[PDB]
């Protein structure tokens, strides 16, 4: 119902934070730094939560609403997946190659949802 939208400045600024943290996650995947995934995921989650808060809850333009849940949904999945690097009992096996792909996939989804939001927001802010 609320079509108020954040500042373009603000979105970009928050977008840059998300992108920086996900980049750090990517490098750690490339580096097989699996013990970095949980702290990276925390930083991404924070960054996501702040960007989603630039918009009113139940905002108005449908594509803003579609993008936000996908942004929020994906941040939630990334955190969950990342915790799985920590096995059930100590010295339990972990399929790190599969998990890492699941992790990166989730990160893709975040970047995707963020760009969607950037695109709609920068756009609506002209006419």
């Amino acid at each position: 119902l609320d079509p108020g939208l954040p500042s373009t400045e603000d979105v970009i600024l928050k977008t840059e934070q998300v992108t920086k943290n996900i980049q750090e996650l990517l490098r750690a995947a490339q580096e097989f730094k699996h013990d970095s995934f949980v702290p990276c995921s925390e930083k991404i989650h924070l960054a996501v939560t702040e960007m989603a808060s630039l918009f009113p809850k139940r905002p108005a333009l449908e594509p803003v609403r579609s993008s936000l849940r996908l942004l929020n949904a994906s941040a939630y999945r990334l955190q969950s997946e990342c915790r799985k690097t920590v096995p059930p009992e100590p010295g339990a096996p972990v399929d790190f190659q599969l998990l890492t792909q699941q992790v990166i996939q989730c990160a893709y989804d975040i970047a995707k949802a963020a760009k969607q939001l950037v695109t709609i927001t920068t756009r609506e802010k002209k006419q």
Binding site: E16, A29, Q105, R123
Partner: peptide, 21 residues
Amino acid sequence: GSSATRELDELMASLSDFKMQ
């Protein structure tokens, strides 16, 4: 926001390439 999106597209290309090697 173009550069915002370009930086996002840059990151998405990198992530999906990691998924395609």
